[PDB]
Design a binder for this molecule. Structure first.
Ligand code: 3PE
Ligand code: 3PE
Ligand code: 3PE
Ligand code: LFA
Ligand code: LFA
Ligand code: LFA
Ligand code: SF4
Lengths: 101, 100, 309, 169, 162
């Protein structure tokens, strides 16, 4: 509730509003002005992205508190990353990530 | 200053709407969409409850909830693709062979 | 109606508007610089006037909302991702606690521009080309976050000003070098820059998704791509090259010099590097850069925990 | 000058269309290989080659896909008139089926003749009146009857007396 | 943070109500993305900053991308369901709407009458969530990696083309 935080909140709100309104006004001016006259590999790579993005979120949570977790948290995240990498190795070796078979 | 009742009521409304979408829609894709709405609503309810108590356990339950949501959306869409490539039809009433 | 709180909030809003306008004009000038290196401001104004006064033709068999929404995403996603970048002490738009997470939010939303353009452009070849392009961008967005996570681990927080302050002694390009190269590759590949330009060029059954976009929507795609490389360069500076920190010059001078250097280096690697094959790109991403980011995070954590008595 | 079917900004619009011209070079025949974007984005069509009957529909379709305002530059004798091919399989000129704004003689013309044609098209664009919007004002395009380039250049051409003999390189 | 919470909850409710009663799959997924962004704004209004960031990153940025991918690759152009619109017929939706309204009434009656000091909305950072995640919730993290591995293996086995 300080002056600086509410100033940055207003600045961020104005940034978002003016940005989206600038894009909207660009499209409105473009439209108004001027005269008139599949393969399953894509699913596989998207699903792999989803799974590895959730595991990436776990690592996102870990990375911001490494010093507070100590070496025990390092061991747990090392087991996590090892399971993650074993899954990646399995996907590569079975041809799931091989785009040209 | 935001009541716990209002957040839980919002989560309940979203859960009920997702369940209705799961029931009334005959396309399997919209059934999966309703499932995603339901699991997101339950995760929102956990976040509301955790924010009320000032505990981090609500966001941890959210993280487990969206891990489940991602993995079961992957499985459900794989089964949807299999149904599409085996029948060329996403009608969920057509896949009803086993009956009492 | 005079109060220092109102003056402070008005000046912060004015700083945010100035930052936004400078980023948009710099994106337009970088479009001019790429078109010339491979008056000029008057030529860009002429291009804008021509794209305004050319009729906007939406295809008859195309979904109007998705077709209109794709260039809006392509512009606004990384243009809003710029809002966390500290260009100078006291010249940041938003001092968010999530920071680089807000950038990841905006990139994940940015993939929808390609998907929506390909679906709304009612063409099977354009659909297949957009599917290939979106598969490529997912394949590099999978490790964009972890390549940032090394630097986040060193700083101990997601806030960008904390990262800049933690780069006071040694810039993060030296310890987080593998994070730096992986983030450079992922930032180039997310923005569809060279060598990840045309994944549809490997097949005659695919077409680019920018085809059927005419006039102002094509201009939105163009300026949005260049604004994306501008904000990628600014994030690169603030995450690996000290941000605004330098010995002699004013801090904005240092930030502008580093950002201009990185924009010119993106132009140079467009002009120099050849584009690899599509399966080579996908294999390189999934098999090299993701494990490298994971190992870099592990080694960074081990070094941090060892160097803490 | 005569014209055939609030003021400063119209001149600015003409200046913007003049200084921003995105060409679509149609290959067709050897004129393009002498000279050596999507049709939605292009505002200039440069037809340079023989208009065969089997791909006159291709030319017509790719011209119809373009969006107003659009201009046409025809390079070479084939595109101007059919050229040396007055024959069963050749359309005698691009302007048989689509309107042409600038013509360039030659077989093939030089690339700097294409630059000269671009200059002429820029002047023609800068001295024309087009509707500002599709809801306000007159919806008519006023092309200006420019003075011909042979009447303008007559004095300096007729004033030529001596030329270098063809015995040298 | 109060006005933001109420307007984002309203946007989320309206967007998912438009989701469940729409015929075009891409339009329905777009409205679902809008509801997810609104729910992320609700999360940010309550101080759950990590949850809102993950709502945009993962839910509206990975899962819905997978849904859009599947919809685009199956190419739903009105395969005997769009031309019928059976869910808009009263006999199909009226019953389940009554059942869901009864369930909502019972749940909301259970919500009311519970003591409430109000949500403070103080920011619970991602650092605290990371400390809890790799502190007292370690086995949750490891078995969640196993859960995502199970989902990966199942989805690969079922969804591969051959
Ligand atoms: C540690 C970092 C490992 C990253 C692995 C990333 C990856 O996917 O590597 C692929 C690599 C080669 O696989 P591929 O190209 O399919 O092999 C054809 C060769 N005939 O795959 C490999 O080289 C195989 C993986 C070797 C290491 C994991 C398996 C053994 C683990 C033993 C305990 C340690
Ligand atoms: C066609 C239009 C479609 C819709 C476009 C978007 C609609 C909304 C536009 C208006 C926004 C109004 C302003 C919103 C509030 C801004 C300030 C804010 O978010 O503050 C809250 C919080 C502050 O955190 P902090 O400063 O770190 O700590 C202070 C201690 N309490 O900071 C945060 O929590 C920051 C995180 C939230 C940031 C949200 C940014 C917008 C996200 C949506 C982008 C949409 C992109 C385009 C469409 C994509 C496809 C649908
Ligand atoms: C306006 C009428 C409707 C118009 C159309 C819809 C436009 C978008 C409306 C919703 C989003 C904006 C709502 C208004 C937010 C204004 C800023 C605000 O309320 O900030 C307060 C608070 C700041 O954080 P805090 O530090 O806790 O504040 C206490 C101070 N000590 O802030 C917070 O704690 C968080 C603030 C909200 C979270 C960030 C923004 C989320 C945006 C979600 C967009 C969803 C999609 C919208 C699509 C629209 C088109 C269909
Ligand atoms: C404070 C310094 C500690 C140094 C020693 C650290 C190593 C000893 C404790 C290790 C605990 C690891 C727990 C891992 C659990 C993994 C469970 C996996 C289930 C599938
Ligand atoms: C490509 C770079 C984009 C930068 C966008 C933001 C520009 C902000 C300009 C701020 C200028 C003033 C900074 C504070 C004073 C220090 C410098 C004084 C001399 C210019
Ligand atoms: C072919 C059978 C299809 C059944 C669809 C689902 C019908 C559910 C009806 C529930 C009605 C509940 C009304 C309140 C008691
Ligand atoms: S005008 Fe001459 S050079 Fe040009 S296309 Fe015809 S034959 Fe070829």
């Amino acid at each position: 509730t300080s002056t600086e935080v509410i100033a940055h909140h207003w600045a961020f709100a104005i940034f978002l509003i003016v940005a989206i309104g600038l894009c909207c006004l660009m499209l409105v001016g473009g439209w108004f002005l001027g005269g008139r006259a599949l393969s399953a590999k894509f699913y596989l790579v998207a699903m792999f992205f989803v799974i590895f993005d959730v595991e990436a979120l776990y690592l996102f949570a870990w990375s911001t508190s490494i010093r507070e977790s100590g070496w025990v948290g390092f061991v747990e995240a090392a087991i996590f990353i090892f399971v993650l990498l074993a899954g990646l190795v399995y996907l590569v070796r079975i041809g799931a990530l091989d785009w040209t078979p | 200053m935001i009541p716990l009742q209002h957040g839980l009521i919002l989560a309940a409304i979203l859960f009920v709407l997702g369940l209705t979408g799961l029931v009334i829609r005959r396309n399997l894709l919209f059934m999966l969409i309703g499932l995603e709405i339901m699991i997101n609503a339950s995760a929102l309810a956990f976040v509301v409850a955790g924010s009320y108590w000032g505990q981090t356990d609500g966001q941890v339950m959210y993280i487990l909830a969206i891990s489940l949501a991602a993995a079961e959306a992957s499985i459900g869409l794989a089964l949807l693709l299999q149904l599409h490539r085996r029948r060329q039809n996403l009608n969920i009433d057509s896949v009803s062979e086993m009956r009492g | 109606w005079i109060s220092p709180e109102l003056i402070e909030i008005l000046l912060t809003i004015l700083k945010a508007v100035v930052i936004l306008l400078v980023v948009v004009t710099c994106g337009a000038f970088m479009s001019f610089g790429e078109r010339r290196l491979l008056g000029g401001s008057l030529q860009l104004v002429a291009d804008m006037i021509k794209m305004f006064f050319k009729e906007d033709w939406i295809p008859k068999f195309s979904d109007r909302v998705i077709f209109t929404l794709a260039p809006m995403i392509a512009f606004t996603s990384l243009l809003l991702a710029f809002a966390i970048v500290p260009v100078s002490p006291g010249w940041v738009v938003a001092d968010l606690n999530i920071g680089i997470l807000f950038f990841l939010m905006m990139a994940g939303l940015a993939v929808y521009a390609v998907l929506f353009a390909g679906w709304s452009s009612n063409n099977k070849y354009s659909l297949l080309g957009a599917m290939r392009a979106s598969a490529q961008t997912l394949s590099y967005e999978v490790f964009l976050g972890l390549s940032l996570m090394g630097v986040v681990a060193q700083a101990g927080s997601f806030n960008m000003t904390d990262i800049v302050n933690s780069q006071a002694h040694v810039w993060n390009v030296i310890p987080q070098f593998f994070g730096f190269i992986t983030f450079a590759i992922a930032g180039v590949a997310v923005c569809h820059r060279h060598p990840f330009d045309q994944p549809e060029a490997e097949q005659e059954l695919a077409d680019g998704y920018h085809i059927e976009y005419s006039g102002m929507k094509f201009g939105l795609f163009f300026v949005g791509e260049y604004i994306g490389i501008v904000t990628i360069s600014a994030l690169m500076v603030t995450l690996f090259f000290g941000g605004w920190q330098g010995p002699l010059l004013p801090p904005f001078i240092w930030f502008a010099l580093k950002t201009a250097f990185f924009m010119m280096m993106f132009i140079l690697i467009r002009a120099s590097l050849p584009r690899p094959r599509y399966d080579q790109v996908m294999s390189f991403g999934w098999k090299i850069c993701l494990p490298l980011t994971l190992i870099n995070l592990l080694v960074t954590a081990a070094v941090i925990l060892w160097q803490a008595q | 000058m005569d014209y055939t079917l609030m003021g400063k900004l119209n001149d600015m619009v003409n200046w913007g269309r003049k200084n921003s011209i995105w060409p679509y070079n149609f290959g067709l025949s050897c004129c393009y290989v002498e000279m050596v974007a999507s049709p939605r984005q292009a505002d200039l069509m440069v037809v340079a080659g023989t208009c065969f009957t089997k791909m006159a529909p291709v030319i017509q379709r790719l011209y119809d896909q373009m969006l107003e305002p659009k201009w046409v530059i025809s390079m070479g004798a084939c595109a101007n008139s059919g050229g040396m091919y007055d024959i069963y399989s050749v359309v005698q000129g691009v302007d048989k089926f689509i309107p042409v704004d600038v013509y360039i003689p030659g077989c093939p013309p030089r690339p700097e003749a294409y630059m000269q044609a671009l200059m002429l098209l820029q002047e023609s664009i800068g001295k024309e009146r087009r509707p500002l919007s599709w809801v306000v004002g007159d919806q008519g395009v006023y092309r200006a009857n420019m003075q011909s380039e042979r009447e303008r250049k007559r004095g300096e051409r007729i004033a030529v007396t001596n030329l270098r003999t063809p015995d040298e390189i | 943070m109060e006005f933001a919470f109420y307007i984002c909850g309203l946007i989320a409710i309206l967007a998912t109500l438009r989701v469940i009663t729409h015929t075009n799959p891409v339009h329905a997924l777009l409205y679902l993305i809008i509801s997810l962004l609104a729910i992320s704004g609700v999360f940010f209004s309550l101080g759950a900053y990590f949850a809102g960031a993950l709502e945009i990153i993962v839910y509206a940025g990975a899962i819905m991308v997978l849904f859009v991918f599947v919809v685009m690759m199956l190419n739903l152009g009105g395969s005997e369901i769009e031309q019928e619109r059976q869910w808009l017929k009263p006999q199909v939706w009226i019953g389940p709407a009554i059942l869901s309204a009864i369930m909502l009434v019972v749940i909301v009656y259970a919500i009311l009458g519970v003591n409430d000091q109000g949500i403070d909305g103080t920011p619970i950072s991602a650092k605290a969530v990371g400390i809890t995640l790799f502190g007292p919730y370690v086995l949750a993290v490891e078995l969640a990696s196993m859960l995502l591995l199970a989902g990966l293996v199942v989805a690969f086995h079922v969804g591969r083309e051959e």
